[PDB]
Symmetry: D2
Subunit: 236 residues, 4 copies
């Protein structure tokens, strides 16, 4: 890429957020934590009204479907996942629509899957779709196709690579990257950097400066864009 | 198949409706005709509460997106389709959710495309999804993937074939199938039968008794299921 | 008023529709008939896009709440209306919002009750609200306050009187007004005119030309505005 | 009442929250802050799933309408509040419905105004409505009638009085009640206690133990119910 130090990260013109499946779902995998989700939608809409062109990759659509049913799964578990995923995708897109249009923005559910990034025709089609959507002041929300799926991070890295984004914020649960497992002497967190780690290395080789923050920390995106020593930063 | 005469069509246990792109969109391709759409949703929900297991194939999602934007396309046509398709898919699934839950039913947007019916892994996945959704008392709504698309009828025929449905109602604009173009002497409509025609022949060879009704006719599905001489009927 | 013959009714600049409680609720009082409701919303939105300034008075909000619960009333009828009315008002306003914004219009739920038309302060406030809403290209939907209520037709007449509307369409179930009960010789329907009848006489004395159509008849509003001999017409 | 010390507040069986007009609207009066609103909805739904019977009094409905229009007010401010209030009430009830049903709860918009608490017939009707709604496992949301209105706190006090609630949480912006204006020596915050102050004294005389917390403090309700020295507590 071109970015080297965290001080430069105020000049990134195309973010790609990626809400991890452990940030937005409450501590059961049986709900949808509204606190962190509303905070992250607030930060993303505010950052998009600032002039950048964000593009979320929302994970965790099975949880909304599980909680929306909560009855037909119960009455069937005594007489007897993808169905929950489908129903949840629909309902979650509705809820995102509400909580985003509460800031003036519009959204547009784009559904892809990892095989769609391998053939050239589908890659061309998807890039054309995303560019026509970005040029219209819309925030695409790129979920994974649930009905053709056997933690959507490699997908986010590859998507940032194709669209060639400046940043790639990768929210998660762990505070960052340590030097050794936490149950050890010398758990020195490595802010800079000489699964998530592999995808970050990939996106680094493809011209993308990955950053791995902590989801539960208040005002995460607005902080990491500014330059505070938060999260993790991958660059030679 | 097994069905021969229209009198037998009261014993079909798995319908596959298919709302044509000229039935639900008002006469501009710039809106969404609520009259026919509400009538067809009413008939389908009533038929599903009767014991059958319907599965719509709703076309015309670009119209809802076009009308929902109506401003950002305007202001851009002076300074300068898939984007409209995406936004419309989201909004239309929301509207279907409302107008179906007004009858007690639940729906679940399933998004496929014609290449998903060629590989074996995706076909297995999709069939498992649809069976897990049918066994849960849900009405799947199978739109075509807009973001990986370069009048969704061949798709409906192939989908009915894979799930192996008894009937396949194929709503449209024309009253049926004539003997010659209308501007000719002897336009004898052929109810029985010794694009739509080709797909119907295909689905006939694959064990599906296709039927082509007229959309604007009031109470179409409830009539054709009963046995009245409406629409068209394909069987040797 | 000023209108005398049905030919003049093309120059009315302020309609007040009133959907009767027997037109939109399906034939159980336990649902919400989507066919007639969608047709009437289509006609009203089309008439409003024509330059007039309509203002619906939607009845039947208890039905939507009854059907939306359908479970918590059931499980309680073995261990043991206004609650259904409240929940239904909310859900029905949401559904109207969807099916109206599908034509570009916006709506704004205004909740009044008959005692609000007797004191002068509340009458002034309500008139100011309605005029500020009409001058903004919005279609107010004037339901009756359910939580302060012990077939909302007198309300519609009085509302048309205060706002001083040219027309007052009063949709209902009966085709019109007969000369005698139907089980009699000589059931001559009286189109012109030298409960509903009393409210119509009132609104006639207050400068409003009431018209009573049949709800189930297709394209009712567009017909009666044109001048066809449909419904009933009250004028000396 | 019966409660004296904050240690006893774990045994209150009927809360009445009241979200102040400065907690949920972002710092413009031109939006709807999703962070605090989602946090408060999360806390209230969690407290209601605990066995209590909460009943919100959501303020700030004009902000949602202002932001939802944002265009028709703009284009009219060059050619030229209650309208915004009406549109906002509708949209905000929809958003609350979504963010509450994401926890399993159902809600039911109840619209009252201060004159509805003075006549006996309307008071009886409203109490019957609220009791029939509480006995159904529903969370009523008691906004003030905007179309018959010339910071809804006296309303909340009187409502808690009529329903005779154990607690009355009154969220706001100020951390509590000080001994003197902040620009003075000796700004000793008074947790216990020997506008908001007047309403609290009233509700104390009517058998209600008022509590005034700080909205922006994370996990406010769950804390104050527990017994931590937060907010303010009114009791002799
Ligand atoms: N269902 C997908 C995730 C879809 C989503 O992004 O919500 C999975 O389990 O991998
Ligand atoms: N956009 C697709 C149709 C999608 C739909 O079914 O709505 C097409 O034009 O073929
Ligand atoms: N609940 C009211 C009618 C309210 C409405 O207009 O829906 C009644 O029964 O009179
Ligand atoms: N519009 C009312 C408040 C209504 C509400 O609770 O949102 C007022 O300004 O007093």
């Amino acid at each position: 890429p071109t970015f080297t130090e965290r001080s430069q990260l105020k000049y990134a013109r195309r973010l790609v957020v990626k809400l991890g499946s452990a940030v937005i779902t409450r501590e059961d995998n049986h709900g949808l934590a509204l606190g962190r989700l509303a905070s992250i939608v607030e930060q993303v809409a505010e950052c998009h009204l600032e002039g950048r062109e964000v593009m979320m990759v929302t994970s965790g659509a099975v949880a909304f479907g599980k909680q929306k049913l909560a009855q037909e799964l119960l009455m069937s578990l005594s007489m007897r996942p993808r169905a929950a995923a489908a129903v949840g995708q629909s309902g979650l897109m509705s809820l995102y629509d509400a909580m985003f249009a509460q800031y003036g923005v519009k959204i547009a559910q784009v559904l892809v899957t990892k095989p769609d990034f391998y053939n050239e025709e589908t890659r061309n089609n998807l890039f054309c779709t995303l560019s026509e959507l970005i040029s219209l002041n819309i925030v695409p929300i790129i979920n994974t196709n649930d009905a053709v799926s056997p933690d959507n991070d490699s997908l986010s890295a590859m998507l940032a690579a194709e669209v060639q984004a400046d940043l790639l914020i990768l929210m998660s649960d762990v505070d960052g990257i340590y030097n050794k497992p936490p149950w050890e002497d010398g758990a020195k967190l490595m802010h800079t950097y000489t699964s998530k780690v592999k995808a970050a290395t990939w996106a680094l080789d493809r011209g993308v400066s990955v950053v791995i923050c902590n989801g539960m920390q208040e005002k995460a995106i607005k902080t990491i864009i500014g330059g505070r020593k938060v999260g993790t930063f991958f660059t030679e």
